[PDB]
Design a binder for this molecule. Structure first.
Ligand SMILES: *[C@@H]1O[C@H](CO)[C@@H](O)[C@H](O)[C@H]1NC(C)=O
Ligand SMILES: *[C@@H]1O[C@H](CO)[C@@H](O)[C@H](O)[C@H]1NC(C)=O
Ligand SMILES: *[C@@H]1O[C@H](CO)[C@@H](O)[C@H](O)[C@H]1NC(C)=O
Ligand SMILES: *[C@@H]1O[C@H](CO)[C@@H](O)[C@H](O)[C@H]1NC(C)=O
Length: 413
């Protein structure tokens, strides 16, 4: 039959209750199997356990000195002193797959195999499409430590040619952009949509390049990975937060921490592997103290902290709103005073129980590589678009303002 090239792809994402990781699913191998993979926005590539329960007649090792090896970074050339199979081959290109949850990397072989996912028109699940020789990294079973039950690897979405967004765009000839719509649901799927906009969420809410607010995509010249070579830039997505307001009032910050130095320290990145936004200690202190004060001004009393949080509150006087609990707003001010990432109660707060709610940010310590890491809870129910062709990040704010959610995409497996 003819196989039409897609204009976009959709994969499901579901939050894991125990680990707070976001887990996607793709199909791979011959015969085709479903793979659950932890989403790593900042990861270099797809990596999978090739050592254990990996059977495929379409698997091919990527040899050293090939164009595929170059696409993967020409990091290493390896040999394996065990029997030949997926993950163990001679004269094979190597990389260092990383598990950022445990902050570990280890050597893995580069390989090709069939990857199959659903196309989309932006509104519903469509016909399946395939990349017959999708380049990925093998990894050992031990690298899976502390990942959600049932996963076999990680889906890296970072700024490399072989990461999912770029490799799908090149394979299918669509735009080098993707959109992530994470959910706090642990029972229902949300989505990542690779390729062209627009995106529809039930009932009829359109999110598109018209509706999104954009900010420049910045580059950190020093890697933020666990392994790297000298002179390698970060593959992560940075944005230029200049100031923070809480309840419309500036929270005074050390601005040198918000800039990215030539040594690669500072700035603001977006992460799916940190479940809560992580703040350098001085920023953490400033933000939490202002939030506590502004909360007290509306009769929301501070109560004992609940790990991992350091600013927790009684719910006695908190009103429920469409945009979440009625707590002080937090604005991350970007390239001008009129371009802001706004965090309403649905994204700022984490319920512990009926009586206690916490500000969902954590103290990352002092002398931290990245000063602000926008994490999973703060991404939920927001559509975030990463456009590598135009070097921009777009964001919707909470979809609750439009009476929809990220789990309201019309996805069918
Ligand atoms: C690689 O070559 C070495 C040395 O000849 C050999 O001992 C080993 O079995 C080989 N590994 C394979 C083919 O995966
Ligand atoms: C601000 O951050 C820089 C970078 O760490 C540091 O050198 C400086 O001492 C800090 N300033 C204040 C007022 O804490
Ligand atoms: C609420 O807090 C405000 C500001 O602190 C205070 O002036 C007011 O008395 C409080 N209202 C109560 C406790 O009903
Ligand atoms: C999902 O989209 C398909 C294609 O239009 C449609 O047939 C189906 O009824 C939709 N499902 C929901 C729940 O809207």
């Amino acid at each position: 039959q003819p196989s039409f090239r897609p204009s976009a792809l959709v994969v499901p994402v579901k939050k894991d209750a125990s680990t707070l990781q976001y887990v996607t699913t793709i199909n791979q191998r011959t015969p085709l199997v479903s793979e659950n993979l932890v989403v790593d926005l900042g990861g270099r590539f797809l990596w999978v356990d090739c050592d254990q329960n990996y059977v495929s007649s379409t698997y091919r090792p990527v040899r050293c000195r090939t164009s595929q090896c170059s696409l993967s970074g020409s990091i290493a050339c390896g040999d394996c002193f065990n029997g030949p199979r997926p993950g163990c081959n001679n004269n094979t290109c190597g990389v260092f797959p990383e598990n950022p949850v445990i902050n570990t990397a280890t050597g893995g072989e580069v390989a090709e195999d069939v990857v199959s996912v659903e196309s989309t028109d932006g509104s519903s699940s469509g016909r399946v499409v395939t990349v017959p020789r999708f380049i990925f990294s093998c990894a050992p079973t031990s690298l899976l430590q502390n990942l959600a039950s049932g996963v076999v690897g990680m889906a890296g979405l970072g700024r490399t040619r072989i990461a999912l967004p770029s490799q799908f765009a090149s394979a299918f000839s669509f735009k080098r952009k993707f959109a992530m719509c994470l959910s706090g649901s642990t029972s229902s799927n949300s989505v990542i949509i690779f390729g062209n906009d627009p995106y529809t969420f039930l009932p009829n809410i359109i999110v598109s390049d018209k509706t999104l607010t954009y900010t420049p995509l910045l580059t950190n010249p020093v890697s933020t990975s666990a392994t790297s070579t000298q002179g390698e830039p970060s593959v992560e997505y940075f944005i230029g937060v200049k100031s923070i307001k809480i309840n419309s009032k500036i929270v005074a910050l050390n601005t040198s921490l918000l800039s990215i130095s030539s040594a690669g320290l500072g700035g603001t990145k977006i992460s799916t592997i940190n479940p809560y936004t992580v703040l350098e200690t001085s920023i953490y202190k400033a933000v939490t103290e202002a939030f506590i004060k502004e909360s007290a001004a509306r009769n929301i009393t501070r109560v004992a902290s609940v790990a991992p949080f350091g600013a927790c509150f009684s719910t006695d006087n908190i009103l429920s709103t469409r945009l979440g609990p009625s707590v002080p707003s937090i604005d991350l001010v970007l390239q001008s005073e009129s371009v802001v990432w706004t965090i309403t109660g649905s994204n700022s707060m984490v319920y512990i129980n009926d009586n206690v709610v916490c500000l969902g940010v954590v103290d990352g310590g002092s002398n931290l590589r990245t000063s602000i890491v926008i994490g999973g809870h703060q991404l939920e129910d927001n559509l975030v678009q990463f456009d590598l062709a135009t070097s921009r990040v777009g964001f919707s704010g909470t979809l609750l303002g439009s009476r929809t959610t990220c789990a309201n995409f019309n996805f069918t497996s």
